[PDB]
């Protein structure tokens, strides 16, 4: 059970894992155009941290994009495969993600959420009220009126993990 960063480096090994992850995303996020998930998962700007069981099996993951200069990252997709849910993996993944983001000198996590997800992200520490200057993400993160923008502050020395 490892939580590794996975990126499109063009190798058969990583590529397969990214596809497996992409397939989990689509099955777990039916309202999302599959081709859209594909585009973000394999683009130059996005990265994926995956939950790997004994070295060759993706059971979950989180695809995100860092805006280094700005020191914030947007969560694009998050999911755990059906037969592995309710085992605490999704929470350990988020914890692992925040710890990694902290080491990456990232100050805030932003993610759009809707319906049930808002409550889920509140449990992970995300809030509707942003302490981060709005003009910091404006122009980098698309502004959608139909979605609730949520943020999680990553304190430099709070232990997430």
């Amino acid at each position: 059970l490892d939580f590794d960063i996975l990126t499109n480096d063009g190798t058969h090994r990583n590529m397969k894992l990214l596809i497996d992850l992409k397939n989990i995303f689509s099955r777990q996020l039916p309202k999302m155009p599959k081709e859209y998930i594909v585009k973000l998962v394999f683009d130059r700007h996005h990265e994926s941290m995956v939950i790997l069981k004994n070295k060759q099996k993706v059971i979950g993951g989180i695809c995100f994009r860092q805006y280094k200069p700005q020191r914030f990252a947007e969560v694009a997709f998050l999911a755990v495969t059906a037969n592995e849910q309710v085992r605490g993996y999704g929470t350990r993944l988020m914890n692992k993600f925040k710890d990694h983001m902290q080491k990456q000198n990232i100050e805030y996590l932003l993610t759009y959420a809707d319906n049930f997800a808002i409550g889920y992200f509140k449990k992970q520490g995300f809030t509707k009220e942003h302490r981060m200057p709005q003009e910091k993400w404006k122009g980098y993160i698309k502004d959608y009126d139909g979605g609730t923008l949520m943020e999680c502050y990553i304190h430099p020395y709070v232990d997430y993990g």
Binding site: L29, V75, Y112, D114, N115, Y120
Partner: peptide, 6 residues
Amino acid sequence: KKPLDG
């Protein structure tokens, strides 16, 4: 992050 009533 589509999650509509998931």
